[PDB]
Structures are given as C-alpha cells and as structure tokens.
Design a binder for this molecule. Sequence first.
Ligand code: ADP
Ligand code: ADP
Ligand code: BTN
Ligand code: BTN
Ligand code: MG
Ligand code: MG
Lengths: 446, 446, 77, 77, 21
Amino acid sequence: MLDKIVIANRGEIALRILRACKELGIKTVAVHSSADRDLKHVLLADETVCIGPAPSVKSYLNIPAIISAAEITGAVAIHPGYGFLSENANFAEQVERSGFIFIGPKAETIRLMGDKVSAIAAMKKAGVPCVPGSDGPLGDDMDKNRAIAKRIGYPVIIKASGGGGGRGMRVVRGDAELAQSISMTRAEAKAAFSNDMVYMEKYLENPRHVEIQVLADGQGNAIYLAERDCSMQRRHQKVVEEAPAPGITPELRRYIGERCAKACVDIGYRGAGTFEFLFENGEFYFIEMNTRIQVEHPVTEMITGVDLIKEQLRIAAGQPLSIKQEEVHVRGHAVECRINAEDPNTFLPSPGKITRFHAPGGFGVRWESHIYAGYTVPPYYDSMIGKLICYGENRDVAIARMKNALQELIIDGIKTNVDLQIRIMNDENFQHGGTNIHYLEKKLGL
Amino acid sequence: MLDKIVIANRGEIALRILRACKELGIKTVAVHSSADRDLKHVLLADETVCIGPAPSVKSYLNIPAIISAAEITGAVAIHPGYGFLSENANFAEQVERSGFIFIGPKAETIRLMGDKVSAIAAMKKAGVPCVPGSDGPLGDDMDKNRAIAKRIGYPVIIKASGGGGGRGMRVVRGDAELAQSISMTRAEAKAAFSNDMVYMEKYLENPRHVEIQVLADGQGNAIYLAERDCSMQRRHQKVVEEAPAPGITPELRRYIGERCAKACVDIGYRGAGTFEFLFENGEFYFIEMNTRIQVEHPVTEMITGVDLIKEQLRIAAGQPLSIKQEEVHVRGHAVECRINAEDPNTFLPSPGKITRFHAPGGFGVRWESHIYAGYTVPPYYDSMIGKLICYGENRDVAIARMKNALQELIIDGIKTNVDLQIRIMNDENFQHGGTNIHYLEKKLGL
Amino acid sequence: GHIVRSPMVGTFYRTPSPDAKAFIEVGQKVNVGDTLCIVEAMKMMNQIEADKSGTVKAILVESGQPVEFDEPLVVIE
Amino acid sequence: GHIVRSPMVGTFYRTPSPDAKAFIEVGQKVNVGDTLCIVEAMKMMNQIEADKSGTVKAILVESGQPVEFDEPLVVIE
Amino acid sequence: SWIERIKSNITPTRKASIPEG
Ligand SMILES: Nc1ncnc2c1ncn2[C@@H]1O[C@H](COP(=O)(O)OP(=O)(O)O)[C@@H](O)[C@H]1O
Ligand SMILES: Nc1ncnc2c1ncn2[C@@H]1O[C@H](COP(=O)(O)OP(=O)(O)O)[C@@H](O)[C@H]1O
Ligand SMILES: *C(=O)CCCC[C@@H]1SC[C@@H]2NC(=O)N[C@@H]21
Ligand SMILES: *C(=O)CCCC[C@@H]1SC[C@@H]2NC(=O)N[C@@H]21
Ligand SMILES: [Mg+2]
Ligand SMILES: [Mg+2]
C-alpha cells in the first residue's frame, strides 16, 4: 500500500487518479498552478498545493516544485498521469533519487523506449515486427539517404526520434524535397523537443492504428489486455478510439499479445504501457510505445473489467500481478470520443466560461471529465475537456449508445467539437468498421 | 421489431424506456400531463402528446387518454414501466383488445399474481414455499382466526390483497387488537385501493428481503437472473438495494432460480417479473410477485450484463428468449441508492426548482435520472428524482465507489435525501452486510 | 380574449359528417350553448361547446389534424 | 497594504538557525531589499528578499508551516 | 457542494527526508 501520493497532473486524468486513490483508500495531494485552483479534482483532493504560475513550463513541468510539494505533504509516490512529465526519464530518476515512488516504469526503461530509434532496435531484437525504414538515425550522407529511400520504397516519412503528439513528421514523396524536408523537421525538433535527431521510415498508406495494452509488475510477469483501434485521427491526433479492434481475430490477437508480453519481459518492463502497431494485410508493424497510461485506456477497462490505474498503483506499491493471462476475457465493445474545447470548423482552442453543462447518463455510458457549469476553461493548457465512453455487447450497440449520449450532452459558452463527433458516429463507413488512419481527413477533405 | 411504442409513464423509467427504444431503432411517443412539459424524456422523445391535467388521477391514470394517444400517433405497443398502470389488469386487457401490444404479462396473469392470496396459492401449488398464514381471505370466524394465529405463532400481520407501496399493512401482536386492526386496515384499503380484501400472514422478525428476477417469453421458456437484497428499507419502502445478495451461495441461487423458472413456465408468464421472498435460516418464504420491471432492476442489469428493458421490448415483439440459463453469469456486485426530493429528517416531499445540479460520474457509476439545472419538481407525483447505481468487482469496491459518487453529487434548490444515503453507506453493519429488514428503522434510535 | 381548448385527445374534425356543413365558420359569432367542433376518439365523436358568447375571431387548427389535451383551437373576443 | 508572496514551495522559517534571532518582527521596519524570511525546499536554504521599503505591518505564516507558491508571507505598509 | 471548499492549510507535522547530496 501507498500511504499518500501526489497527482502531478490536471483535468480528466487527475480526476481518474484521485478517484482510484479514493477507492483504494490512498490519501491524495493535488498539485496545481495558480490558474487551476478551480479544478474539480483540486476541490475534491485531501490536500492541495499551488506549485507555480499559470504557464505549464512554470507549474507542471517544474520538477523541483512537484518534489517540494511531495516533501512538505509527506507523500510517498508521484503519479504523472499522461502528458507533461509522464514520459520524462529525468523526472523518473529525479523522483527515485529523493526516496519517492514513481508510479510507472524505470528511468532506464523510459530512456530506452523514449527514443524510437532505440525502441525499434529493441523490438527487432525481441522479435516484434517493425516498419521497414532507415534502421538508424539520419546523417548528412545524402547518397546513403537516397539509397535507403530507394531500398525501402517511396513514399517515405521523416519522424523525429523524440517526437510526440503527432508533430515533427513530414511525408516526402521524392528526392526533390528530401533535404528541405529533413532540414525543416530538424528545425521543428530543435524548437519543440530539444533533439534534432530524425529517422526515415516507410510510409504505409492504408494502415490501421492498432495498439496493445500490457500490464507488467517488473518481476517477470506481463499480460496483454485486448487491443484498441485509433484509426479515426486528424493531424495524427486521435479522435475516436475503440476496443477490441474490429476484424482482429482471436488467433491474431493472441499472436500479437503474447509477443508483446514476451517483449515486455525482455526489457524488464514495469507498470502499464502500450505498444502501437500499424495493421495492414494481417501483419503488425511496430511504430512506437507509450510508457504511461494512455488517454483512451477507458475503452480497455470497459471490455475486460480491469481497472488500469488501480493496477498501476498496486504495481508501484510492490504487489505482483493479481491477474493471470487466462483470466482476461474480452466481453463487449467500447467506443470513445474525445470532447475537445475548440472551434469545430477551425480546430482552434476556444477557452471561456461554461455557462450550461449536462453530462449524459445511461446504461453503459461513462463520462470522464472535470468540467462543470460555471467552470472557466483556461487557455494555457491543451484543449481536451472530457471523454465519453459508451459500451455495449457489440459494436452496433456501442455506436447507437454513443449517438444517443452525444445528443443528451450540453456544453454552452464555449466552442466544442461535439458536432464533429456526432457526424463521425453517423458516417456509414465508420459503422462498417476497419477504416484507415487517413479516412477522417479524406472525409473532411480539407 | 415494434414500429412505435407509447411510454405511459414519467421520470427515470420514462428515460430508461426512451433510451432502450432509441438503441433498438424504435420510435417513441411520450405521453405527458400538462405539468410535465419540461421532462427530459418529453424533450427528447420523437413525439409528445398531452393526455390530461396535472393530477395523476386525470393524466397518467387516464386509460382512455393513453389509448387515444397511441391511436392518433399510430403506435403498436404501450410500455407502462412501473407504478401507475403497470399492474392494472384492466389496462392490460383494454390495451390488448384495442389492438395494441401490452409490453408486459397477460391480463390473466396480472389478475392471478396481483391477488396475493391467489398468488400464494399458485406458488404453493407450483412448489414455491410460502410464509405460514391464513392460506385464504379472512372471514368472520374469529374463533378460527385466533386458532390459526395461535397455531402459526404470534405476532401476525394483516396485509391488503390489493395493497401496494407499503401501505395497508398492520402488525398484530396478540388477539386483543386483531379485530380492530383488521377492520381499520379494511377501511384503509377501501379508501386507497377500493378493495377491502385482506389476509393474515406470519410475521418474521429477522428476515432478509430477497427477490429473484425472471425473464419469460410466454412460449414455454423462462430464466432467472441472480437476486437482489432490498433489506435496507424504511416505512416498508426500499432505500438501498444490492445484487447479488451477500451470503446466498450459488447452490441456493440455483435452487430458488429453478423453482421460480418452473413456476413461471407453469403459470404461463410472459415478460419480466420479480419474485419477492423473505430469507431466514437458509430458507426462502415467498411473499409477493411483481408483474412489472422493478425500480431496482439496474443492479441486476449491471451484474448480469443483460439489458432488461430491451429484453422486455424484444419479448413483446414475440421474439423467443435468446439467452440460455447457462449463459447467464454474475460477475461483480452492484449497489443502488434511491435519491428522493424530500426532507432527510421529516421525510416529507420538498418540491421546488433545482438551481444547480452536477451529476456524479466515473468508472462503474451509473446515474439514472431525469432532473437538470432549472427543472421544477412538481408536487403532484412521487418524490423520487433519480437512482444512483455503482458496480465493482466486490461489495467493498462497490460501496467505496458509492461513497465517492454520493460525495460528488450536487442537488440544490430542494431538500434531498443524499446525507441519509451517505450515512447508510458509512454504517459499519451495512458494510459488513446481512442486515435484517428492520435495521434501518432501528438505526434512527427511536 | 378567450380561448377554447380541447379537453380530450383525438382527431379534430369540423364537419359532423364526411360531407356536411361545418358547425361554425370565421365571422358568424356564437353563443354559450352551441357546438363548435368535433373531437373523435375511439369512434366516438364528442362535441365542444364554447363558454363565452362572441365573434369567431380565428380558428387555430385544421380539420383532420390530431390534437391533444389543452390544445388551443378557437379564440372568441 | 503590500503583500510579500512566497516564490517557491517549502517550509517557512524566521530564524536562519534553530537557535538564532528572528530576521524581522512586526513593528521594526525593513528596506527596499534584504533577507526577510526563509523557505526551505529540498535543503538549499532560500532567502526571501523584500521588493519594497516599508514597515512590517504583520506576518501571516508561523515558523515551520509549509507554504505554497503565491503564499502571503508578510504585509508591509 | 464541493465547488465551495474551505481551502484549508497543510499540517506541518508531516515530514519527508531527501538526501542532502
Ligand atoms: N511509418 C509510418 N507510416 C505511416 N504513417 C505513420 C508512420 N508512423 C507514424 N505514422 C502516423 O502518425 C501517427 C502517430 O505516430 P507515432 O509514432 O505514434 O507518433 P506520436 O509519438 O506523435 O504519436 C500514427 O498513428 C500514424 O497515423
Ligand atoms: N409476512 C411478512 N412478514 C414480515 N414483514 C413483511 C411481511 N410481508 C411484508 N412485509 C414487509 O413489508 C414490505 C412490503 O411487503 P409487500 O408485500 O411487498 O407489500 P407492497 O406491495 O406494499 O410492497 C416487505 O419488504 C417487508 O419488509
Ligand atoms: C375509422 O376507421 C375512420 C372513419 C371515420 C372518418 C371520419 S368521419 C368524420 C370525418 N369526415 C370524413 O370524411 N372522414 C372523417
Ligand atoms: C533534512 O534532513 C532536514 C533539514 C531541515 C533544516 C531546518 S533549519 C530550521 C529547522 N531546524 C532543524 O533542525 N530543521 C529545520
Ligand atoms: Mg502515437
Ligand atoms: Mg413489495
């Protein structure tokens, strides 16, 4: 057991972690900035500590401030949630230095999987398939670069090793723009992640983003909980995630899952992770791994009945895995929709006061959000304000429940992307299932 | 399926029926009174028809009005839900004769099981044990009455045959007040239900109200779906239900379920019904059967995964039961709390506008209600404004989840029994479980 | 002024028979005791009587259109 | 009524040592910039300098009490 | 009504030890 933990995050994940803590009887410390005093989890937390001013670089990315909050409150662990410092190896080792428990993998594990150039190598060593590509960082040897591009086959995509959030990616169709594309990708990587390293990979045009969720306790045990299907993306930022992935037969599911679990055992992984694969022609092609709880993880919780955050807390506390591989059973189909706060026709964030708010209810509808009537959405942080997960005995029931629950939801005073979700739900190809990662941009066409 | 149906009810059950209809692609007609034009299901329904003035006796109990509303809109079914006309055999026969499917049991079965004396006789015939009692309507032979009372053993209780809602029941300790109690209970029954028939039954002082859910398609098939322990009651009205009942081993569950399914097959039951019981010394004693979907069915839905109202709609359409008895699996534990708009101390209704409202959410928490910010709770109807169901992998997880959800619920502008529910949740004996049907009243210490 | 509203639920007709003369028409006024419209329910064609004598200002419904309880039909000034 | 706010999360102290004289006290006034109180965070004793000359109107936090960011520490004038 | 919370203060008695180096 953990006596007390610090929720070093905000918004929906902070509520999730606080609520799991309350269930497990763990005392919660909610560190916030000076503009986050109004957050629902901050008002529901046992102790609250204002760690910095509004900007993220001064409040939530401030490792010393979070450590000081943990120190003064006498906490024993720190849950980073997702975003900010969840995948920060410096945060991991700096939290572990000071005698605090980092709820997540080890610092070395985050360093290894944190740069895709090394993660791909580790996966190839472990037998997990990977997309053919540069198989190494890109240098200035332009002749070698073009030879590699010819070998793999055009088109090609340049991806930053430290890239995240869908940025720092450029698609190159020919040698004409290769150098300029590489230069601009390096510049963006320098300006964003402080790492100009880039690598080139084959650009599959009809894949399906299928990711595996795995729980490992760091003691030689690891399990895999079904998968997901995040193929409904815009600008490489997911919009609708669902599990289990349609069309993935139990044979293929087990084949990929057991290999993922073996790979987890290979690197001595700990906590909850996620392997991201591209599905095409029945072959999986690893692209990256997320060493943290994923935003869309609630879909995996509603089909297996396994609370992932409580599993993370138990694993951090030292207890081994209490779930056997045979005990995991997929019963149903869940569909999630991220409700952002932005102009639906311009995808620009829209901060402002929420005058009316009414969350939907019903049998199998989960609403995961921190907003409430009279909550002023701040402009400093990301635009996501909630998630809506609907569950049913089959995909059609889940989609119908989603369509019902999207109409019953009211959010006034700010420009939110609920109508986009409603029109995505009504799309016929989506109802068919198995659409590709580029389908949504084609549907919008602009 | 049914082309269109009429929801001859109001409040939470109306939303439950509307949502089940929407998921199934069924059009909905929402009949309402003149004071219920702001109900959520009325504003979400496909069609709306006003059937009468504010009082229930003129609008929601006006069988001709509901039949007319079904006729003009071209409906093909009428779903009564619970209360009002759900257990009105006259309504069933009139609806079926007019040419509309009645979503529920047959008129003959409603007549048979509604009369508690005939229900007890049929249960004894079919092999269902019953509480020792008069075994027939009370006569004028006071000598025989007192002889039977002495034989079974005092105390005894006089219950109206057509009684409901916990009214028209009187407990007798000895022969002194038997005649006067019987006469006054008969007068009360005349005043309330227009039926003075009464019967006498043995009074068990430490029972546990256990009820079984049975689904039967009326074609010779019937199944049972776990049970529910509605022990926590005040004034003979349930406050907290849960499912499955603690301490009822699977052997007893299968035993009573097989007996109840056989009884349903024998008496040609159709639809969804509930067999109430009293549990003591490992033996059940039938008391009454509810020929309608019950207020606390969501717990059964959440533990078994079977949508009961959708099953009702499918059975009414004639489809045979697609769920076998072996395919019904109980997985977890659900606890439900009824939220009423009343004084937590004086237990009197508190109608009024709701100035603010923020419903609870999270993992494994269902909020089934019809209120919103600005809703004006009318004084003409029952005081229930919603139900709150929480599900977990065991009783303790579900109760902790319930505590969090109750702490998270806001209802202002009226007086609501939320603090009482929190108190019940915090009771140590309730957390241990197995409390008797009289525990809550004794908890008040009066 | 005053509005007469349907007291029951059913189809609305103005002529007592498929081919007959309407009970009232715009213009010509009515008195307290007189039938203004027909409300059919379950093959029973009920009649509606006004309560205030005055001119038939306007008819708010159309023949054959189903109505509901408390449905405004005609306004008398 | 100027208010000096703590610039970091830590524990508040008045004496630079456990058994030393307090830096300031209510009454006795201060200058534009000088040590006023201590906030300890991860060791590394930190000194809070006033940003305004003035008199110490009051002090709001006792010694040993953890303080957060933008915690009112003292009131000057 | 968790929206209006008292904004209580932290209990100083809680102590955590960080290595000096
Ligand atoms: N090799 C590739 N071929 C085609 N598309 C890709 C490839 N790699 C990434 N993408 C696209 O970018 C998305 C995000 O890639 P990912 O490596 O997960 O980056 P991030 O770390 O930014 O999420 C993928 O879902 C996919 O749509
Ligand atoms: N024979 C009995 N012995 C003890 N208590 C009873 C008996 N019958 C009814 N009760 C009490 O009254 C409650 C309601 O009884 P029920 O017959 O279901 O009446 P109603 O139709 O009003 O709900 C039961 O849950 C139980 O607590
Ligand atoms: C019953 O099935 C429908 C027949 C009734 C038709 C009514 S009589 C009044 C109206 N006049 C007319 O021409 N048809 C309508
Ligand atoms: C590290 O183990 C803690 C050092 C705390 C130093 C401060 S100086 C004022 C107080 N006196 C003391 O001994 N501890 C406090
Ligand atoms: Mg990704
Ligand atoms: Mg009952």
